[PDB]
Amino acid sequence: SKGEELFTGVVPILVELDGDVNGHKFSVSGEGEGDATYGKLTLKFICTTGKLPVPWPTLVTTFLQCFARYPDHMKQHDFFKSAMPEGYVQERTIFFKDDGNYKTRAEVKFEGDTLVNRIELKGIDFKEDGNILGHKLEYNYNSHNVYIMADKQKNGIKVNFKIRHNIEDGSVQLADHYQQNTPIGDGPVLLPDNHYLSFQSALSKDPNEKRDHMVLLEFVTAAGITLGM
């Protein structure tokens, strides 16, 4: 498989995001690598414009589903790799329960031998001292399942999941994610049976880094389709 073949080894990654949340504008640059064979991504992010005006964990899902590890019997349900190298557009609305929303548009494609995630993010109607603008979120992440189905009407997929952000007082801030992906190229892509991606993530810091930043590790494996009865 052409697409699949581009992910057999370790692949360098670059991430660029330009954001505006409630009028606070910022930019983040990220870099690292992904290894689809093991379903593993390792990335470091730096806010190039100063202090990040929202908590790092709220941007984790925005900052590479093409690095999921698909079991063999599921490999023909991997839309993400099938769209490469031309790439795909990933769009979302994320509703923070009882708070504002993020809307994102991103292009994920190969630029030379590097896989590049380029993002625009706009956020509105956040409360000045809610969990997001008030920075009340713990610096950590939980595991979640990301549900995928075909969207034939658009030659792409529709994706949904619900993120739990732990809050420093023992409560949880929910973030309801709605996502669609469509290929950038005209070539045939694989449209999948219903299935999900199992995510686990861990956030940490670079002790030598002067800038506001995030080190992120993700492990992603596809599941939900069985071999046999």
Curated annotation (Swiss-Prot):
Gene3D superfamilies: Green fluorescent protein (2.40.155.10). Changing residue 194 to I: In mut2.1; shifts fluorescence lifetime from 3.03 to 2.50 ns. Changing residue 149 to T: Increases fluorescence at warmer temperatures such as 37 degrees Celsius. Changing residue 158 to Q: In R10-3; matures to the red-emitting state with excitation and emission maxima at 555 and 585 nm, respectively. Green fluorescent protein has been engineered to produce a vast number of variously colored mutants, fusion proteins, and biosensors. Further generation of mutants led to more stable proteins (at 37 degrees Celsius for example) with brighter fluorescence and longer fluorescence lifetimes. Changing residue 142 to I: In ECFP; leads to cyan fluorescence, folds faster and more efficiently at 37 degrees Celsius and has superior solubility and brightness. Contains a chromophore consisting of modified amino acid residues. Maturation of the chromophore requires nothing other than molecular oxygen. It holds the Pfam family GFP. Changing residue 167 to L: In R10-3; matures to the red-emitting state with excitation and emission maxima at 555 and 585 nm, respectively. Changing residue 76 to R: In Azurite; shifts the excitation and emission spectra to shorter wavelengths and increases quantum yields compared to BFP. It comes from the Eukaryota. Coiled coil: none annotated. One of its GO terms (biological process) is bioluminescence. Changing residue 141 to C: In mut1.9; shifts fluorescence lifetime from 3.03 to 2.74 ns. Changing residue 141 to F: In Sapphire/H9-40; exhibits a huge Stoke's shift, with an excitation peak at 399 nm and an emission peak at 511 nm. In Azurite; shifts the excitation and emission spectra to shorter wavelengths and increases quantum yields compared to BFP. Changing residue 144 to D: In Cerulean; leads to improved quantum yield, a higher extinction coefficient and is 2.5-fold brighter than ECFP. Photocytes. Keywords: Chromophore, Luminescence, Photoprotein. Changing residue 163 to V: In P9; increases fluorescence at 475 nm excitation. In R10-3; matures to the red-emitting state with excitation and emission maxima at 555 and 585 nm, respectively. Monomer. Belongs to the GFP family. Energy-transfer acceptor. Its role is to transduce the blue chemiluminescence of the protein aequorin into green fluorescent light by energy transfer. Fluoresces in vivo upon receiving energy from the Ca(2+)-activated photoprotein aequorin. This is Green fluorescent protein. It comes from Aequorea victoria.
